[PDB]
Structure 1
Amino acid sequence: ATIHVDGKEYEVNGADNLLEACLSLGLDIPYFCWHPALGSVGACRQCAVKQYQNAEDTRGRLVMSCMTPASDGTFISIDDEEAKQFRESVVEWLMTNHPHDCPVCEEGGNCHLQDMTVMTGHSFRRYRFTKRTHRNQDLGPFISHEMNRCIACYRCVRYYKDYADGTDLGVYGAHDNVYFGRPEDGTLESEFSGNLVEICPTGVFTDKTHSERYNRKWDMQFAPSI
């Protein structure tokens, strides 16, 4: 397939969507709800790019790159001004309820939400009202729960239920009061519940064993082991 991103021609796979095709080419599009192992559901509305009907088109429309296929002869723009403003607006809406928690959060320096906040160029807050609060649950000795940091990207429920076939983690409530977790306090019953600490782009589900003796990612000595 042939796509044109910002006037540059690329050869992609027509069976992929535009987000995974453009991320495979090294282009940077912010995203939250899409995962390579989970698929595209179009929740966070963050991966917006401007699609044009043909080469001689100037108007276009904002579409989700994760929901739009990477078909042949597809003209899109990532660095368009309207798309950039919309992505910064999505980060701004996610920043309205987010707690002032980065120093005391175990995802600091390892946070996908921090990365996409910086990448969108959003560093000014014109929101002056209150932020919603949630009480935490006890998820057992491995996963620490902090629901204030959630951005409702639905990755945890999608992985835990649709991928890992777990039953004890879900989504409750409606509007901006959506809550993610167990119906009551107790240990997460899945054998693959620890992948939530990397599935969650925020610091909601965190490693409690690492949180006991915590240090940031830049302070680690890593090795490739088995």
Structure 2
Amino acid sequence: MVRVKVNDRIVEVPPGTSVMDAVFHAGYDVPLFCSEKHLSPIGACRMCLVRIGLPIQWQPKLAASCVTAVADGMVVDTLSDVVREAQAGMVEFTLLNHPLDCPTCDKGGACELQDRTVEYGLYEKYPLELPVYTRFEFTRRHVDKHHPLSPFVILDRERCIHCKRCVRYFEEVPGDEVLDFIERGVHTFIGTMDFGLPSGFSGNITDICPVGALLDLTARFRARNWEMEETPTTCALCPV
């Protein structure tokens, strides 16, 4: 198997492994929005960036660890100042136009954006200088809000960060295309002409959306993510 090195660690890993899996299998960490388990990785959020050497032969531009294959004897750097500064910058770009709904957002604590923001954002700039959070002091993007797409799912087009998870899933897993973007640029937004949301497996996007865009109407405004008492069990509605 192929030998990879992450910042202090050497890992055996099968050849077809993505660099991201080699980082995490190596025990390091990297932001993650565009990619998902069982979904085709495509470099979209540009969060998964690492440094890659393949001889010390450092790459010119940052490598997308979500769509990078791994080669034997590669050096992966996730702790260099450049990588951390770039990840914080991309978080800044992503939260740029976000609707300021966290306290009243149904996603609350179990929101990947919140966690990766507090994880990687605001690189240590060098004093005890009075810090500034956001540079964006302009008018934010405002689109349609709290729109029920279906008797189970509600849609907030402002919270979408334009990942591909729901449409990637919709084409891949059920094979039922009842969702895709409409326009382009920053005006891009999610919509449908199939209104009943006919596919019998739509609910999973509720869990996948790294933001609170698509939320469960049957569980909207009941309790907070940490507040619910979890009971892991097995469903007996059908024999699977």
> TM-score per shorter chain, which class?
over 0.9
**C-alpha contact (below 8 Å) 1:159/1:199 kept by paired residues:** no
Partner of 2:66: 66
State how 1:209-224 maps to structure 2 within 5 Å.
Answer: 209-212=218-221, 214-224=222-232
Partner of 1:164: 174
**C-alpha contact (below 8 Å) 2:34/2:41 kept by paired residues:** yes
Task: Tell me the alpha carbon deviations over residues 154-195 of structure 1, each in whole angstroms, 9 at most, x when there is no partner.
Answer: 1111111232211221111001111113237x3311111100
In the alignment, the residues of structure 2 paired with residue 154 and residue 166 of structure 1 have an alpha-carbon distance, to the nearest angstrom, of 15
Partner of 1:97: 97
Distance of aligned partners of 1:26 and 1:164 in 2 relative to their CA distance in 1, 3 Å threshold: farther
What RMSD, in angstroms, separates the aligned Cα atoms of the two structures? 1.7
Segments ≥4 residues shifted beyond 4 Å: 57-60
**C-alpha contact (below 8 Å) 2:23/2:76 kept by paired residues:** no
Partner of 1:174: 184
Matched to 1:219, the amino acid is: E
**C-alpha contact (below 8 Å) 2:19/2:65 kept by paired residues:** yes
Counterpart pick for 2:134 among 102, 125, 128: 125
**C-alpha contact (below 8 Å) 1:3/1:73 kept by paired residues:** yes
**Structure-1-length-normalised TM-score:** 0.92
Distance of aligned partners of 1:58 and 1:24 in 2 relative to their CA distance in 1, 3 Å threshold: closer
Matched to 1:217, the amino acid is: N
Shift of 1:22: 2.0
Greater Cα radius of gyration, structure 1 or 2: 2
Partner of 1:23: 24
Question: Counterpart of 2:148 in 1: which secondary structure?
Answer: coil
Task: Select the structure that is richer in helix.
Answer: 1
Partner of 2:78: 78
Task: Tell me the alpha carbon deviations over residues 123-142 of structure 1, each in whole angstroms, 9 at most, x when there is no partner.
Answer: 81111011111114431111
Show structure 1 runs of 5+ residues with no match: none
The sequence identity of aligned pairs, in percent, is: 33
